Amino acid sequence: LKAQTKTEEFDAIKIALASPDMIRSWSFGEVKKPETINYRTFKPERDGLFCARIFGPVKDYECLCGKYKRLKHRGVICEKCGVEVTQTKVRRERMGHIELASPTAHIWFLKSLPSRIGLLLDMPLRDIERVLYFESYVVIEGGMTNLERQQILTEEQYLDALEEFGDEFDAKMGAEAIQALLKSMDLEQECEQLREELNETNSETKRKKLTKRIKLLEAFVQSGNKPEWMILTVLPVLPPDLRPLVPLDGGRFATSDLNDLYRRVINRNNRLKRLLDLAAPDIIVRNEKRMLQEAVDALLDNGRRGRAITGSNKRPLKSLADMIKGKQGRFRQNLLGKRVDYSGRSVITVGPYLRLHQCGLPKKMALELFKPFIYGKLELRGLATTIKAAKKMVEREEAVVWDILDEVIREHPVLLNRAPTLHRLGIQAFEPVLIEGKAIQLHPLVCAAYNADFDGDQMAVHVPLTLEAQLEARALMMSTNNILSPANGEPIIVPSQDVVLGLYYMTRDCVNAKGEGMVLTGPKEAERLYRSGLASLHARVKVRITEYEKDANGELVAKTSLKDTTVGRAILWMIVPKGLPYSIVNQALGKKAISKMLNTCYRILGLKPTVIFADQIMYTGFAYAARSGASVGIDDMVIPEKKHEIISEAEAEVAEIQEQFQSGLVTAGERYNKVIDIWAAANDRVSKAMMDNLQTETVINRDGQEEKQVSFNSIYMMADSGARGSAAQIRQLAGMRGLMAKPDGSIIETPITANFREGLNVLQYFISTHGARKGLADTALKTANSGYLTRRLVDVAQDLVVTEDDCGTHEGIMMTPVIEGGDVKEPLRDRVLGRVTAEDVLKPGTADILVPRNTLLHEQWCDLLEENSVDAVKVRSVVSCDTDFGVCAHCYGRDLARGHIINKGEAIGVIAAQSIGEPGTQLTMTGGLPRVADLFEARRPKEPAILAEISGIVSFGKETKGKRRLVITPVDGSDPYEEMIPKWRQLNVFEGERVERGDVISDGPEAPHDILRLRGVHAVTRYIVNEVQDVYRLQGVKINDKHIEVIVRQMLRKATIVNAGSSDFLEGEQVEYSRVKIANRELEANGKVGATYSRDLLGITKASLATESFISAASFQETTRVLTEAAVAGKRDELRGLKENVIVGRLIPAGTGYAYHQDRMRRRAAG
């Protein structure tokens, strides 16, 4: 079968050096003149940087001279001025060239940090520049005389050396010499020479540097690149329209800086050509060559020499390297990142009437957005003769068009996005609802997921054009399909504030209210009692209710009873669907209980019932909250009656300790701390006074004498329900507020004795100011810290995607409760939930299999384990998964916005990174958000501890040489380990005991590198998760351990070989490649041997550095170095990743695209 020739849809890409002849292939002509445009008629002058002959017609399908103006003539080359009449687009495509008189060095291969030309010739850089500037002569192919091949001579020395040997020895200077060296260089012969020398001399110092060079050389040999190409003979010119001269208003012109650069290179070059035919003296032509060299360098990458400046403007002219480069890496994909059609934006508002699956869309916005759809539908039914008439119709805004828009709008989701996109819920699909007005209406329950307040925040709209985008939006990005945070299984659609204050006020009970004690047939007639004004919303009442339990086999049982409840709870039951028990609504319904309600509803009835449920809860919450007439008055804030007394008593203590300091009974420092303690205790005292008074002090009467219940006072209801406010903020309102801190951080010893209900005087406010300003500053900075963290995180993971189904390994980690210092900082049920068992678990007794091998542990299975006493469960994790180049779905977990096991092809790395990064705003400024960054960066602490390197009996040897050696002695194994540890660090380790490998030989923090090396992979991964989870959990952030585990796996992605027989002995390399390779030896070729590796720990920012795709690396790294370092080796990028596929603009090899790429990947390496 025949291959191909013309443009098919390409896969992969290759990059390499460009031959001079190869450069001529692209060039359709030589730019011979610095001239640009004619200066009167603005047409391009032939042949110049802008040329119709070389590049293309100025206007579409029209010859320059004007002889052939007809659209029919196409492949015709005009006889006057050869211009093939073709679309002006080809002026954006066709390249050109320039033939340089003298050779020229390519600055990228000269000045890249490991100078490429330098170490290829094994010659220093400073010398090479000295040869390019004609400051000395260099030898080439010395023959048998006096001289080294690469030796450098001076003027006098070259002459003296020349008198002895005239011929059979040759030396040059300048660019031609370096080019001659590279051409004369035989890489193959040099390779052989380097092979012998490795074996001959044995020294680490020697063969270390040695091995670096030989791999590089042979790589360049295997590459196919020939060394000469690092010196430019021919120079390609960029198409004119990519650096346009295009006119502006007022008749002035503007053009790209490249022109100023290109023009210069031409002039100087041309001048040199002239200077050859005039036989100028050496000193001049030398100076001209140097001038040409500087110009080419400035053109390619400016700033590596003098930083040449553009004409009349101080600011340095932007060169070709700076067009690619930027902040950061490339401008193309970096923030930000390209403008997009079919979009819009405006201020957003509430719209509580909306169902959770829809959103209010302004009329005008929808008109301008769907403009093409409106045109096409208008002429599909025949209301408009042709597309033009449709344009005039919508431009006239005729009344008939509004009905047509409802058709194109109906089933057609729109994407809503907010400004700081963090996790995937930052964009969600909704069904549009036409709304008069210029504001966007957004379902309240989603306002939590977007973290969108109403203080004037704006949101953006995107239209899903292609059919696949409609079904992607509807089945993935739809609002109703993500109700649960991917970070933790708790619902993120949880009612927020106003709604929950309603339900709290709804199901609550006072002591005496209208209708107390009566009985009703059912919830229906309960509402009939309330709405008519007979019964109070909260009164204790028995009513017949019908609850449900599905406890049969997939089948709903029904049960009825007389429940003791209130009127509000009775009415609310009408909403609760089917199989939920009445126990869930019988409580006071705070914000905490109201979330677990929604959660249970999802895990029992499924998705669909939960959605419609959630809507009803919101609607009823707002409604009843409005009925409640909740408000806040100045008399709603009750100050304790005992406050003034508490302040006075605490005021005596300070004068007591003060009396002790004047008489010297106590030191100055002890005094400060002392006063601060008594004042602090006072604050707690006042706080827990107003708390008692505020909470229960409503004391009311039912028929009998007195009694007291939880207060119905407004502000209290807010704090108790979970709607808004908390004991801390309230403490500032009624009781005294805190002890502020002076900028230096020393909490002031005279607290703020007043509060907001009273007035603050001059001083108290002035002292309060620092706390506010430092608060705002810290957050504004912590905003940046969070973003940077997510960046590094998603960079190190990204391309990680669920690929196989089950890798089939029994391996996994042991999950126990966190049990931190007191009692259970986190239970067992949360740690194992939604994960998969590593092996079958026993009861406390045995021959009883509870969970059969690998099974998803859902709510029932975790409760069945909890019924029994089971204290420990082994769980498959993403760090242990045997699948190479990905994660098996069985090792990950179920977690998603859906409860089902994770689908094949979902990209978990990104959602993992987003879940870890988003909460980082709430962390502190050891501990805090920077503490997390240190953990993921593997950074070694300042004064670390040391662990026993190997098991066996240890002892102390020699003496204090600034280090006192520690010698470990295994029983059977070899002794030789003796480490020199400075002894001025307090020891721990018992001098006379045998230590298991990895025990504590001293105190202080430990480097996570150790834990991996000595204790092992599972040990170190447990260390990271438990420590990082401590930081977040202390602040109340719920992040499932899964995400942290996937980040960890990428940290250890690389390993260092130990044994040999196929590979590079000491090379650090991917454990993915190795494991498939050592499997390729266990039964393949030669056993050989081999190879044993050692897992390595790379910090997040360091591990992301290594990426197979060079197009990916060129994005976030330093562009120049990446391109060079890849271009020499001829590396062939196969795509296969996410980052690279986004750049080139095709389907992501994940999710919906995963079917496509998979099917194509197999087509490759086949026939």
């Binding site: 500037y133 000193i283 100076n287 001038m291 500087e294």
Partner: protein
């Protein structure tokens, strides 16, 4: 030191300035050099006959007086 401005000033600074007498010395050699080639051209038979064939083209209206001689010494 890179900065090609520097490597020029230093490359030319080696050449030593001419004395007022030295100018004529070099200039005399030029005259000698050219006069050598002028006489060498005068010694070629084809150089004469060619000039003849060229002047016959001038008189034949195949050329102009400006395209052959710039004027004579006398």
């Amino acid at each position: 030191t890179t900065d090609p401005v520097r490597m020029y000033m230093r490359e030319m600074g080696t050449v030593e300035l001419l004395t007022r007498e030295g100018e004529i010395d070099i200039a005399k050699r030029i005259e000698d050099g050219i006069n050598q080639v002028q006489c060498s051209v005068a010694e070629y038979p084809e150089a004469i006959t060619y000039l003849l064939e060229q002047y016959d083209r001038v008189e034949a209206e195949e050329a102009r007086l400006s395209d052959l001689i710039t004027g004579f010494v006398d």
